Amino acid sequence: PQITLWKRPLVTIRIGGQLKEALLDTGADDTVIEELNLPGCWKPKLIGGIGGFIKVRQYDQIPVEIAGHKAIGTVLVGPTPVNIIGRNLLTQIGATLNF
Amino acid sequence: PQITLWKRPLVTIRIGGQLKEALLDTGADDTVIEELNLPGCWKPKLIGGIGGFIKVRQYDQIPVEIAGHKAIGTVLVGPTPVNIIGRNLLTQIGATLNF
Numbered sequence A, B: 001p002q003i004t005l006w007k008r009p010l011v012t013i014r015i016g017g018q019l020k021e022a023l024l025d026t027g028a029d030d031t032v033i034e035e036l037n038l039p040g041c042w043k044p045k046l047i048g049g050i051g052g053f054i055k056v057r058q059y060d061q062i063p064v065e066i067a068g069h070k071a072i073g074t075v076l077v078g079p080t081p082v083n084i085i086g087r088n089l090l091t092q093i094g095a096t097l098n099f
Ligand SMILES: CCCC[C@H](CC(O)(O)[C@H](CCCC)NC(=O)[C@@H](NC(=O)[C@@H](NC(C)=O)[C@@H](C)O)[C@@H](C)CC)C(=O)N[C@@H](CCC(N)=O)C(=O)N[C@@H](CCCNC(=N)N)C(N)=O
Pocket: A008, A025, A026, A027, A028, A029, A030, A031, A032, A047, A048, A049, A050, A080, A081, A082, A084, A086, B023, B025, B026, B027, B028, B029, B030, B031, B032, B046, B047, B048, B049, B050, B080, B081, B082, B084, B086
């Protein structure tokens, strides 16, 4: 599929059993999901951008399906206004920018 | 071009006669550039990111050449960690996401 950028590129994802909306973000190195009480071991991390840094929980080897395309990798969980799909998973689904 | 996402999608831009490097950022509504002088009048604004809010200067109707493609639109100037080309200009150059 092709997604234009007139509006925020929000798509449906599946993670930890749940369907969520998330932003496809070519400016994000990593994937950041809103507070979600996932089981499993995790480790502490800090991530930054506009406004500074936040504390997140890093979970590895989490299946994330993005618009029906399966991916699996690292997911950072913390307090975000929007779920963000970053390059670590965008590459797995073969996403490119085109102009 | 077609740009893959194994590395950050950084490109050269020209703005106010100067060359700069910037990140193609589908997660950004707006284009935000590090502190600099631009010609003309600006208005104060606040924007948010992953870590919270910052103050920026809003300049309207600024010509920006992005990897050789022309855009004319709003540029926010302030303490962003990375120069970012957001959807307001990405749409002008015809950029889409594809997978
Ligand atoms: C939580 C908000 C959605 C996330 C994006 C993130 C991002 O613009 O892609 C930035 C771009 C690079 C840093 C500036 N990426 C990031 O913040 C990511 N950072 C990174 O990838 C790296 N960090 C650094 C510092 O480079 C890495 C080393 O960790 C983090 C998500 C962590 C993985 C973001 O901050 N968007 C802002 C950009 C500023 C702007 N004005 O466009 C935005 O759209 N803000 C809107 C809010 C959106 C509401 N709009 C809406 N349509 N619903 C606004 N007006 O303030």
